[PDB]
């Protein structure tokens, strides 16, 4: 194609992205930055403030999922992994809206999400982070980087990579419009392990890449290399996920008490 159709694609995708993902990057940035009206996240920066915070958010999950009885490094990890599960569900509903996705072989639909969801989650996490911490509870609280950096032993070394990633990624100044298509392009990757019919996936992705190229031209006319930088980010995100999987599977042997939601167990099962 062809301008009006690539623009109607970009628009379809943004409209779905807003229906699928509760806290947009625009609203997260408004929060992190100061503004809105609608005024000002609770901060977690020590044990006392963590416990004050947990009392604001606990109604959110049924009683067992609070894991009261676990040391805090593990509750925080359990809380992220459960928020990640909620992410997979939003991404799945997002993916279903990508023209052509639901007409793919169902087994391929599963493979695209299996291999896609972690890279997407890293991209979403970046919209919630600045140099100083991370928005939590759908933007209602803010956990400082230093607090997370002070968790015991294994855990306290492991957020800092998320932070350095986000800082470089957020320096691209992508808007939700850009992110909607960037995300759709990651999902429709034709080179995931075990795909049955690669061609119809590449064919959709080709349309998506043309919509993304047009979107960045229009929305970032002052950055001619931005498309290329974004494709490079997709490679970075693969390598980051690789690292993460390999780490999980060496840490989890030490950290009895660490448990994966079964949705994530199926995801990690043959995942590289």
């Amino acid at each position: 194609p062809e301008s009006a159709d690539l623009r109607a694609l970009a628009k379809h995708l943004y409209d779905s992205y807003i229906k699928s993902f509760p806290l947009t990057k625009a609203k997260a940035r408004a929060i992190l930055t100061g503004k809105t009206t609608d005024k000002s996240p609770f901060v977690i920066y020590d044990m006392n403030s963590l416990m004050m915070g947990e009392d604001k958010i606990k109604f959110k999950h049924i009683t067992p999922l609070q894991e009261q009885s676990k040391e805090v490094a593990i509750r925080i990890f359990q809380g992220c992994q459960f928020r990640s599960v909620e992410a997979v569900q939003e991404i799945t509903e997002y993916a279903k809206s990508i023209p052509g996705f639901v007409n793919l072989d169902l087994n391929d639909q599963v493979t695209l999400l299996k291999y896609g969801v972690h890279e997407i989650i890293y991209t979403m996490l970046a919209s919630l982070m600045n140099k100083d911490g991370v928005l939590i509870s759908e933007g209602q609280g803010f956990m400082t980087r230093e607090f997370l950096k002070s968790l015991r032993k294994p855990f306290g070394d492991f957020m800092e990579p998320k932070f350095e990633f986000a800082v470089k990624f957020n320096a691209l100044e992508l808007d939700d419009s850009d992110l909607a298509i960037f995300i759709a392009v990651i999902i429709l990757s034709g080179d995931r392990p075990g795909l049955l019919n690669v061609k119809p996936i590449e064919d959709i992705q080709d349309n998506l890449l043309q919509a993304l190229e047009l979107q960045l031209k229009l929305n970032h006319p002052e950055s001619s290399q931005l498309f290329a930088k974004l494709l490079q980010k997709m490679t970075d995100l693969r390598q980051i996920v690789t690292e993460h999987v390999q780490l999980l599977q060496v840490i989890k042997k030490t950290e009895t008490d660490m448990s994966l939601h079964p949705l994530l167990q199926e995801i990690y099962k043959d995942l590289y």
Partner: peptide, 17 residues
């Protein structure tokens, strides 16, 4: 269906309820 029972159910036409 797999193997990826949950994911397969999420992929069902529908919409969470």
């Amino acid at each position: 269906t797999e193997r990826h029972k949950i994911l397969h159910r999420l992929l069902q036409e529908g919409s969470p309820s």
